[PDB]
Backbone as numpy.savetxt, mean C-alpha at the origin, in Angstrom:
# Nx Ny Nz CAx CAy CAz Cx Cy Cz
-9.89 13.00 -0.56 -10.60 11.68 -0.13 -9.07 10.57 0.67
-10.30 9.24 0.97 -9.53 8.46 1.95 -9.85 7.27 1.66
-8.81 6.31 1.23 -8.80 5.33 1.17 -8.22 4.02 2.08
-8.72 2.97 2.86 -8.26 2.52 4.23 -7.79 1.36 3.27
-6.17 0.93 3.50 -5.76 -0.79 2.96 -5.08 -0.76 4.47
-5.81 -2.35 4.59 -4.78 -3.22 5.52 -3.91 -4.06 5.44
-3.06 -3.87 6.23 -1.91 -5.22 5.81 -2.48 -6.21 6.82
-2.21 -7.52 6.88 -2.36 -8.37 7.48 -1.04 -9.52 6.95
-1.48 -10.48 8.00 -0.38 -11.62 8.11 -0.83 -12.78 7.00
-0.22 -13.31 5.82 0.60 -12.13 4.66 -0.15 -11.35 3.50
-1.32 -10.59 3.55 -2.07 -9.99 2.60 -2.14 -8.63 2.34
-2.81 -7.68 1.69 -3.02 -6.24 1.13 -4.61 -6.67 1.13
-5.06 -6.04 1.94 -7.02 -5.99 2.00 -7.42 -4.31 1.81
-7.26 -3.94 0.31 -7.99 -4.60 -0.56 -6.84 -4.78 -1.11
-6.79 -5.58 -2.04 -5.33 -6.20 -2.84 -5.25 -5.76 -4.06
-6.28 -4.43 -4.56 -6.08 -3.75 -5.91 -6.79 -2.73 -5.22
-6.54 -1.87 -5.07 -6.59 -0.24 -4.51 -6.69 0.74 -6.39
-7.54 2.11 -6.57 -7.30 2.64 -7.30 -7.61 4.12 -6.57
-6.67 4.87 -7.70 -6.39 6.08 -6.84 -6.74 7.07 -8.17
-7.16 8.56 -8.13 -7.36 9.28 -9.04 -6.04 10.22 -9.30
-5.80 9.90 -10.93 -4.69 10.90 -10.94 -4.81 12.76 -10.89
-3.08 13.08 -10.36 -3.48 14.16 -10.26 -3.83 15.12 -8.87
-4.46 14.31 -7.87 -5.09 14.78 -6.41 -4.15 13.41 -5.65
-4.49 14.64 -4.34 -3.57 14.05 -3.61 -5.25 12.68 -2.58
-4.49 11.59 -2.34 -5.10 10.57 -2.15 -4.60 10.32 -0.96
-5.37 10.09 0.61 -4.78 10.06 1.87 -4.81 8.35 1.89
-3.78 7.18 1.73 -4.04 6.30 2.21 -3.48 6.24 4.13
-4.64 5.31 4.40 -4.41 4.90 6.20 -4.68 3.47 5.99
-3.20 3.40 6.57 -2.46 1.83 6.79 -2.36 1.47 8.14
-3.13 0.35 8.05 -3.55 -0.17 9.09 -3.13 -1.81 9.34
-1.77 -1.92 10.52 -1.52 -3.18 10.52 -1.95 -4.16 11.58
-2.95 -4.86 11.19 -4.13 -5.80 10.94 -2.95 -7.09 12.02
-1.68 -7.23 11.08 -1.39 -8.47 12.28 -0.35 -8.96 12.87
0.02 -9.87 13.21 1.06 -10.10 14.15 2.36 -9.59 13.78
2.57 -9.76 12.50 3.75 -9.42 11.78 4.11 -8.02 11.85
5.51 -7.45 11.61 5.99 -6.42 11.14 6.06 -6.20 9.62
4.74 -5.39 8.76 4.58 -5.58 6.94 4.89 -4.25 6.73
5.62 -4.24 5.56 5.57 -2.77 4.87 4.64 -2.64 3.75
4.57 -1.25 3.22 3.82 -0.87 2.38 4.96 -0.28 0.80
5.19 -0.86 0.00 5.98 -0.38 -0.80 5.64 -0.38 -2.31
5.46 1.37 -2.87 5.32 1.14 -4.44 6.63 1.44 -5.38
7.18 1.02 -5.37 8.33 1.21 -5.72 8.23 2.27 -7.38
7.59 2.05 -8.32 7.51 2.87 -9.41 6.70 4.40 -8.52
6.24 4.81 -8.05 5.45 5.60 -6.79 6.45 5.79 -5.79
7.38 5.12 -5.61 8.31 5.99 -5.29 7.91 6.00 -3.14
7.46 4.93 -3.06 6.42 4.55 -1.74 6.62 3.92 -1.09
7.21 3.43 0.41 8.23 2.64 1.50 7.65 2.90 2.76
6.90 2.54 3.52 6.28 2.61 4.43 6.53 2.32 5.25
7.27 1.39 6.55 6.98 0.47 7.30 5.89 0.32 8.71
4.86 -0.44 9.03 3.86 -0.50 9.59 3.99 -1.80 10.69
3.66 -0.84 11.74 3.86 -1.95 13.46 3.44 -2.97 13.34
3.02 -3.56 13.72 1.79 -4.27 13.79 0.54 -4.07 15.05
-0.09 -3.53 14.89 -1.17 -2.88 15.74 -1.19 -1.76 15.38
-0.24 -0.97 14.66 0.06 0.34 14.22 -0.75 0.64 13.24
-0.96 2.08 12.95 -1.44 2.57 11.76 -0.60 3.89 11.19
-0.22 4.31 10.18 -0.07 5.15 9.68 -0.82 6.16 7.77
-0.83 6.92 8.40 -1.19 7.99 7.00 -0.69 8.04 6.49
-0.75 8.25 4.58 0.25 9.01 3.57 -1.03 9.60 2.75
-0.28 10.69 1.77 -0.51 11.43 1.33 0.13 11.43 -0.12
-0.49 11.23 -1.57 0.34 10.28 -2.31 -1.27 12.00 -3.95
0.08 12.17 -4.92 -0.49 12.63 -5.66 -0.20 12.22 -7.00
-0.77 10.83 -7.20 0.50 10.39 -9.17 -0.01 10.83 -10.18
1.29 11.51 -10.87 1.30 11.92 -12.26 0.77 11.36 -13.33
0.67 10.11 -13.34 0.47 9.06 -14.35 -0.29 8.23 -14.36
-1.10 7.40 -15.17 -2.23 6.73 -15.35 -0.87 5.28 -15.71
-1.67 4.03 -14.93 -0.55 3.29 -15.20 -1.41 2.40 -13.68
-0.61 0.81 -13.83 -1.01 -0.29 -13.11 0.43 -0.42 -12.11
0.19 -0.46 -10.87 1.69 -0.72 -10.13 1.77 -1.59 -9.07
3.24 -1.97 -9.32 3.06 -3.27 -8.07 3.26 -2.50 -6.70
2.33 -3.41 -5.92 2.50 -3.06 -4.71 2.95 -4.76 -3.56
4.03 -4.27 -3.33 4.69 -5.56 -2.53 4.85 -5.10 -0.29
4.89 -5.40 0.55 5.69 -6.12 1.53 7.23 -6.55 1.00
7.95 -5.78 1.93 10.06 -6.13 1.56 10.48 -7.67 2.46
9.66 -7.81 3.13 10.28 -8.65 3.98 9.29 -10.56 4.24
9.44 -10.50 2.24 9.33 -11.45 1.95 10.27 -12.24 0.22
9.84 -13.44 0.29 10.95 -13.50 -1.40 9.60 -14.76 -2.30
10.03 -15.78 -1.76 8.86 -17.00 -2.75 7.91 -16.62 -2.04
7.14 -17.07 -1.05 5.84 -16.71 -0.62 5.64 -14.93 -0.03
5.26 -14.41 -1.55 5.44 -13.06 -1.55 4.18 -12.56 -1.03
3.83 -11.35 -1.08 3.01 -10.64 -0.22 2.58 -8.76 -0.89
1.54 -9.00 -2.10 1.56 -7.85 -3.55 0.35 -7.97 -2.87
-0.14 -6.72 -4.58 -1.57 -6.03 -4.28 -1.08 -4.92 -6.08
-1.95 -4.62 -6.34 -2.14 -3.44 -7.75 -2.60 -2.12 -6.95
-2.09 -1.14 -7.47 -2.37 0.45 -6.83 -2.61 0.85 -8.94
-3.67 0.91 -8.89 -4.13 1.08 -10.48 -4.32 3.12 -9.86
-3.85 4.01 -10.90 -3.81 5.43 -11.26 -4.99 5.39 -12.23
-6.15 6.59 -11.97 -7.14 6.22 -12.93 -7.90 7.99 -12.74
């Protein structure tokens, strides 16, 4: 199965994603903003760079239930974040 995530300036859409445990989910990442962004989920070992007007897909097979922080690395105080729930 495929879940699409839009990266834009400066947010993730959806900002809460839910992915099945112990199955490969393909995340289709589309950077529709004008800036460079990252798709980074530290506790799931995910850290992808996506250029403006480009797309990448990654496939993830999480093993543990939980709620994990999604961030873009290119911010400090004005953060760009979301949540990935493994379910």
